Design a protein around this ligand. Structure first.
Ligand SMILES: [Mg+2]
Ligand SMILES: [Mg+2]
Ligand SMILES: [Mg+2]
Ligand SMILES: [Mg+2]
Ligand SMILES: [Mg+2]
Ligand SMILES: [Mg+2]
Ligand SMILES: [Mg+2]
Ligand SMILES: [Mg+2]
Ligand SMILES: [Mg+2]
Ligand SMILES: [Mg+2]
Lengths: 122, 37, 175, 215
RNA sequence: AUAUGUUAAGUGGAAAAGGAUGUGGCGUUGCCCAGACAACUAGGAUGUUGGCUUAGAAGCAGCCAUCAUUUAAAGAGUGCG
RNA sequence: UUGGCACCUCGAUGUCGGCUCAUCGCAUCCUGGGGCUGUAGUCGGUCCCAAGGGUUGGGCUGUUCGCCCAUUAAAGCGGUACGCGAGCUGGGUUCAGAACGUCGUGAGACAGUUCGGUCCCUAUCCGUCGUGGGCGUAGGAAAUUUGAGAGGAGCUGUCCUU
RNA sequence: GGGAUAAGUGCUGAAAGCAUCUAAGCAUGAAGCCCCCCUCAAGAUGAGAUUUCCCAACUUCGGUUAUAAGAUCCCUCAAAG
């Protein structure tokens, strides 16, 4: 469950350290998001340098919610923080050094570049 | 189809007819299709 | 009604048989039957039919001249048979018979099946010319207007199911 | 075709092909018999009626429902049968099958049939507008005294009445409702159960009506 | 209810500029068994586009100049172009 | 809509917005079907048919409005005492305090600002949401049903193949 | 998914020798309309239908006495309130 005005850690070296969501894109009236959902968001704490800077409005994909996802075999997965990877409007990222574990459930959302730049996917 | 109270021939080849209670004009170019309304 | 004074409607070996209110026309390709009218009366004096209107009113003058055309078009497709020819234009439009029913390929994602009915034979000449043949002018006009509701002609190139001598109004629209 | 009566035992889960967990409602569709065959020549419509759970016979000083009465003896005697607690008609079935007295067993369905399950709801009692209907409640602070009331019930004096269909409070209620396009996943013939995929309306030991999908 | 009409819209049982005919009634009028009005198809001309000829334009940028007759009969082309 | 008129109400017809709950028109915002195009396609434009359903979340302003950030298939326009306060708030404003500007000799005033400023009601009838009792249904019962009718539903994106 | 249609699209076809979607006909045509789907429904006073059960005498039969099938009071309860 990630809605408007949730602070998320940014899980790569795209230039951002914290980001808050404006809208959950998708359909009209869409309230929450989970792993694999793209959100549009403004960075609040930014690294000095990098690419993005404080006050940019970026699109970004959800990796590793704290209220994680359910799988077809009745399995679950949950994480200790909400994280996020800033993408570059072709489902490809801005950085090359994605941090932290990524949920498996975005392999099927054509985020294969985010998977290959990541640590162990679970 | 141009609906208008004032249906008229626009060129000389356009003809004026009544279909189902309404005054229409028929012509070879389809820009002169009119029905009155 | 000058189509009603010329109410001769000259027959042939086709033998027109009245039935009182309506008329059946039989011949070499026969058995058409049509409930015509009540006011228009009928007389076969020696060999031809005749359609006579009373009272000279507007309803009796409209409905009389149609009733001559309803005798005459029954007795002439049973005499000869009505044919309306329709044509494909386009790069890769191939009509062909599936036996009794006709199958089009007009640029869709699917073939279009025009299922036949009685008194109608579909014949394709060279995959681009289709003939509809039959004995009644309304039934071979109705099915010769469903073949081109599949794909009507188009102004910018001409592609689509045409009639035989149709003048397709064309435009010159370039990028 | 293929109607049957049962009762809700409860709810479990089952694993399937490639280990997929699928939720499951166990329905004990036991001892159903065909109890009266109805014909258009007598009634106007073709149906059978199935009696579900047999109860004890006629007793003279019976004070409760588990002993049948004399109209229910003689009705379930015209078929060679025991008197049943629940009796329902099924008119989607073919009337030319189902001889009267047939024990319509649990293996009329195969794993993978689409079905409709008809049952009553739970029944919640007298409930208010934001629970009986999905109404937005008022603000809980900022001075307000409107929380769980219904809102306005009309317009002022054009329509000087309240229109019907107003969605006011009252009994949430156990009323009949169908869930459509459920699957049968597993038919245990010896236990006489059906595992239907998902949840069906009603409380436990209720009554269901598993018949095949009209869609 | 009689008698004679009218209207076909439920007009009756709410409008206007205008738009059309839809039928009534009353005229005036010019056409015609020397055969009209359709429609039938059949000659469609020619010097010649002649001139200003006009991007060449030869029914047509625009000035028309638009005379004779291949002719029973059509135009220095009615006109679609 | 701004008005005009002064007909109802001054032994009271009580409040602008917002909230909750809506409902109705169609002069249609999206989706449906068409005509025309100065419509190649992709897009459009314009007109016609149509109310079935749908028609976002924030920032600023008390604001209606408006601007703006995001979206969305679309973020329709109106009517219902500018719908709805014996359903709610009371920010806006006609109360007493105080202050500025301005005006007045003054007490004061502005319809200029600014800070603060008590929201009563146990539902009789109608109407609505549930629920029982009585009687009728030409014998009395138990059980299953017919459906005259009424109500609910009804939206739509994206992607892949062609 | 069916019917019937809107705007539209036609076929045949006169009136009006032609032409003409209309006048007589014949089609086709939408998230709309009617079904289809889901509920609720014989207080549907038109009160429906099927199946099963029950069958009285006293007695100006006025009524009473009892009762049938069936219920209910009461009592134990909740899947119901
Ligand atoms: Mg005009
Ligand atoms: Mg709320
Ligand atoms: Mg009120
Ligand atoms: Mg009227
Ligand atoms: Mg006065
Ligand atoms: Mg409209
Ligand atoms: Mg009031
Ligand atoms: Mg003061
Ligand atoms: Mg002073
Ligand atoms: Mg204070």
């Amino acid at each position: 469950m990630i809605q408007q005005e949730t602070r998320l850690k940014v899980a790569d070296n795209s230039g951002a350290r914290e980001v808050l969501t404006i809208k959950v894109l998708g359909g009209s009236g869409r309230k929450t998001a989970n792993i694999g959902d793209v959100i549009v968001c403004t960075v609040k704490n930014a690294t000095p340098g990098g690419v993005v800077k404080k006050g940019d409005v970026v699109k970004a994909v959800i990796v590793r919610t704290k209220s994680g996802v359910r799988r077809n075999d009745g399995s679950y997965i949950k994480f200790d923080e909400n994280a996020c990877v800033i993408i570059r409007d072709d489902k490809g990222p801005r950085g090359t050094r994605i941090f932290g574990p990524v949920a498996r459930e975005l392999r099927e959302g054509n985020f294969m570049k985010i998977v290959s730049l990541a640590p162990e996917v679970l | 189809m141009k609906v208008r109270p004032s249906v008229k021939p626009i060129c000389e080849k356009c003809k004026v007819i009544k279909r189902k209670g309404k005054v229409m004009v028929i012509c070879e170019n389809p820009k002169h299709k009119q029905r009155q309304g | 009604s000058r189509v009603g004074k010329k109410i001769i409607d000259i027959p042939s070996d086709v033998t027109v048989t009245f039935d009182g209110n309506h008329v059946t026309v039989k011949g070499p390709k026969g058995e058409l039957s049509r409930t015509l009218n009540e006011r228009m009366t009928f007389k076969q004096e020696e060999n031809t039919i005749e359609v006579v209107r009373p009272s000279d009113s507007k309803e009796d003058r409209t409905n009389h001249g149609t009733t001559r055309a309803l005798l005459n078009n029954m007795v002439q497709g049973v005499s000869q048979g009505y044919v309306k020819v329709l044509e494909l234009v386009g790069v890769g439009y191939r009509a062909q018979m599936q036996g009794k029913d006709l199958i089009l390929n007009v640029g869709y994602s699917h073939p279009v099946e025009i299922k036949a009915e009685e008194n109608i034979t579909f014949s394709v000449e060279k995959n681009t010319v289709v003939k509809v043949e039959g004995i009644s002018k309304e039934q071979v006009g109705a099915l010769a207007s469903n073949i081109r509701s599949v794909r009507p002609p188009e102004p910018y190139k001409g592609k689509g199911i045409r009639y035989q001598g149709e003048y397709v109004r064309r435009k010159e629209g370039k990028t | 075709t293929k109607g049957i009566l049962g009762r809700k035992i409860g709810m479990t889960q089952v694993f399937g092909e490639n280990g997929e967990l699928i939720p499951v409602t166990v329905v004990e569709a036991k001892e159903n018999v065909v109890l009266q065959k109805k014909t258009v020549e007598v009634d106007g419509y073709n149906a059978i009626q199935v009696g579900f759970e047999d109860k004890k016979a006629y007793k003279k000083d019976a004070k409760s429902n588990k002993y049948a009465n004399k109209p229910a003896e003689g009705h379930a005697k015209k078929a060679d049968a025991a008197p049943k607690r629940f009796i329902r008609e099924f008119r989607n079935v073919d009337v030319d099958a189902y001889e009267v007295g047939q024990e319509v067993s649990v293996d009329t369905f195969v794993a993978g049939d689409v079905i409709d399950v008809t049952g009553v709801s739970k029944g919640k009692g007298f409930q208010g507008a934001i629970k009986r209907h999905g109404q937005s409640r008022g603000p809980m602070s900022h001075g307000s005294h409107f929380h769980r009331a219904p809102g306005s019930v009309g317009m002022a004096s054009d329509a000087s009445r309240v229109f019907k269909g107003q969605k006011m409070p009252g009994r949430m209620g156990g009323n009949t409702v169908t869930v459509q396009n459920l699957e049968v996943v597993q038919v245990d013939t010896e236990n006489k159960v059906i595992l239907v995929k998902g949840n069906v309306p009603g409380p436990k030991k209720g009554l269901v009506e598993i018949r095949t999908s009209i869609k």
